[model samples]
Target chain A: ALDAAYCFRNVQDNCCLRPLYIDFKRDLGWKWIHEPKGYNANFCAGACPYLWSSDTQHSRVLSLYNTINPEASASPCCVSQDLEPLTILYYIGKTPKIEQLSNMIVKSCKCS
Target chain B: ALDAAYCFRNVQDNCCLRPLYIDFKRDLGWKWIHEPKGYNANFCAGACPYLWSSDTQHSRVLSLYNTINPEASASPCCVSQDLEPLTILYYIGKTPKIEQLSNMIVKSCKCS
Candidate 1:
């Protein structure tokens, strides 16, 4: 059986962090956000082999579990390693207000 | 004429994630938390040069600013990227209870 492309360095592909532009207006599909309708938040995908120095030991155990049992759910996680905040001008009752969204911008990704 | 050991591939030190033991009991210095005294939560340190595929453009601009002017505060951030919850059984009025601490475990670290 073949693993999904998201797996770490699997199927002749290296798992890595990738760019993805997040269009808040288009993504949330909400007309409320008034300004800064779009931004690049970025994302991560793929699988992991030997544990990176920064990956969690718990995740390492899970990855080891996957090794012992091929069908053991998912492999190592290709996930966000860091995030940034997003600020936007939004509308409430046609009134424009500025606000901040916590952890909306993905700053980095890694397989752990 | 030298960079801190944390800089990305700088001074014979490549920027990467590293491990740090998170001890709720010892580190927090609180008698409140019960069970799970220590665990490897991990951390990241160092600097970044060229932008990573997943790092934010906002940070890239910040890096450029640093290059254009070396005294621009600090370099790119070495920060927590992914975090995990820490579950602890604590005491309240001599009662043992369990609760989850948000983002207590550092799952991965990155230089952005």
Candidate 2:
């Protein structure tokens, strides 16, 4: 019964999914910066636009280090030069975690 | 830049994050059912509304089996009797995977 339509409706109503904006560079001091606000997005930690996926042929995971700060880097993060805009959907509820949602998506979304 | 605002916008525009519905009972034949389409929701696979989380104090994960179909079940799934409605946000892009989005949410959102 939990379907995309339901999730969409709940998200739209703001009944469940609360929105939050995060700047990896400003907030977390990461090199790869995502500017949800505008174009010409900047990278702080020598980070580039990377897409995560299990599809080896489509994208590969990498360990990226910050050119600005060596200490700041993402290990085993998904990346691809041809990666497109990434959209993430998270579940909100008591004890909400990532794995459950992940499996649910895989099962329901037909994602390999 | 990839941020909540940007994600919100993209999702709103339907540019990414396409919606889908899965009925654990009807669609997949499970007792636990989600009725995004109705009030008196139905159950099929001996399933229940479970909220996944690492917070042991809040919710616990379980291996749920189908009462109707012995072969059908969800192993290591999040569950809680007092579990609230679940909301999941997934990232969509080339080779989209769940792990990246999960980590991103954890890093960006203040969820434990």
Candidate 3:
């Protein structure tokens, strides 16, 4: 008998839903100018927020990306503006790729 | 090797997004006890649609709310407008608390 506000009887079960934010860098090159220095600018990306739902309350997905230009940085971008309209995506987890090591071992053993 | 439409590579993985609608009843007490007969009204709750993305494509989240007012139903209300703004809350999942039966057994055991 919790307060109706904390209740998860209906859509309240969806309390796990949260907005997603993504940050990406876009390169803007310097243009030729009268002087040696050229005109260039840096701007923050827009916010891209999306909903997330899952069997478990937490997410297991991991993301790793390095910036092409070490000097440049990216800001938050809108999901709807930059990406598709889908509401959710499922990740089937990942496994290490050690086929090469295993193959080397097998080859050496067989040769011997 | 799926198409971009079904792609879960990046924020595109957020394809599982969905909207939520909550129907509710706001009893507008009969205006003045006029003529015994009442002038009732019905309207759709403005869409309180929200986004949902979860770890699994499918969600273990289950929602079950019955309309207590029965005939006089309710409509969806905005999460931010109607409820708290906490992005996420972990649900421990219900585990029946059968204290009475356990207590009964303990009492009987002690008596014997």
Best by DockQ: 1
| Candidate 1 structure quality by residue, lDDT tens digits, A7-61 | 3344334345555564654543546777787876554545555464225555554
lDDT of 2: 0.22
The per-residue C-alpha lDDT of model 3 at residue B1 equals 17
Q: What does candidate 2's lDDT look like per residue over B4-87, in tens digits?
A: 343334443211111123333443233432223212111101112232222221111211111222332222221111111333
- Once model 1 is optimally superposed onto the true structure by TM-score, how far is the C-alpha of residue A37 displaced, in angstroms? 1.6
Which parts of model 2 are misplaced by more than 4 Å? A1-15, A34-112, B1-112
lDDT of residue A9 for candidate 2: 44
Candidate 2 accuracy as TM-score: 0.15
The stretch of ten residues in a row with the least summed lDDT in candidate 1 chain B is B1-10
In the range A1-112, model 2's lDDT, one tens digit per residue, is 1223433344332111111233434433443323232221111011122222222211111111112223322222211111113333233544333321221111111100
Q: For residues B23-103, what per-residue lDDT tens digits would candidate 3 score against the true structure?
A: 111122323222323211111111211112211111101000002212211111211111111121222354322211111
TM-score of 3: 0.11
lDDT score, candidate 2, position B44: 9
Q: Model 1, range B16-60, lDDT digits (tens) per residue?
A: 555556555554345666787666655444555545322455555
Model 1 / residue A92 / CA error / Å:
1.4
Model 1 Cα interface RMS deviation (Å): 13.6
User: Residue by residue across A8-92, what tens digits does model 3's lDDT show?
Assistant: 2343322211121211111112121112221111111121111122111111010000022112111111111111121222223
